[PDB]
């Protein structure tokens, strides 16, 4: 009987552990994807800032 209880508890524990790991990993992955995409857009804004800065360095000529 105690072995039966031990196996039920083991099943519950590892169900919980694997699900928690999966949800943590998914949160990390989606966060990294968004972050990469946000920083890419920011670098794009930067190139935009650079070129608009450049326009001011030719009119003074």
Partner 1 sequence: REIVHIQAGQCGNQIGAKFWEVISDEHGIDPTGSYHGDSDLQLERINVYYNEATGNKYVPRAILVDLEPGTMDSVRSGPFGQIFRPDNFVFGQSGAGNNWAKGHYTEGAELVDSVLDVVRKESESCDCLQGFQLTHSLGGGTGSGMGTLLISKIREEYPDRIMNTFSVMPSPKVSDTVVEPYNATLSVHQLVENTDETYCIDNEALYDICFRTLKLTTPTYGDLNHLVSATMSGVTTCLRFPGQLNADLRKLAVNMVPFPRLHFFMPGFAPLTSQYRALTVPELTQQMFDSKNMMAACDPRHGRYLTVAAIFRGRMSMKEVDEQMLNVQNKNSSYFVEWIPNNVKTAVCDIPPRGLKMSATFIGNSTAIQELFKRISEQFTAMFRRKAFLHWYTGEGMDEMEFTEAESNMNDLVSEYQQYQDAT
Per CB under 8 A, residues contacting partner 1 are 1-5, 7
Would you say 9 or 29 has its CB closer to partner 1? 9
Would you say 5 or 61 has its CB closer to partner 1? 5
CB of 1 to partner 1, least distance (A): 6
For the chain, how long is the longest CA-to-CA vector? Answer: 92
CB of 11 to partner 1, least distance (A): 10
Identify the residue whose tokens are 């890419």.
40
Q: What are phi and psi of 60, to 5 degrees?
A: -80, 60
């Amino acid at each position: 009987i105690q072995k039966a209880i031990e196996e039920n508890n083991n099943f519950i524990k590892m169900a919980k552990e694997k699900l928690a790991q999966k949800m943590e990993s998914n949160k990390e992955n989606r966060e990294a994807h968004l972050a990469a995409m946000l920083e890419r857009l920011q670098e794009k804004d930067k190139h935009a800032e650079e070129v608009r800065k450049n326009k001011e360095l030719k009119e003074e000529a």
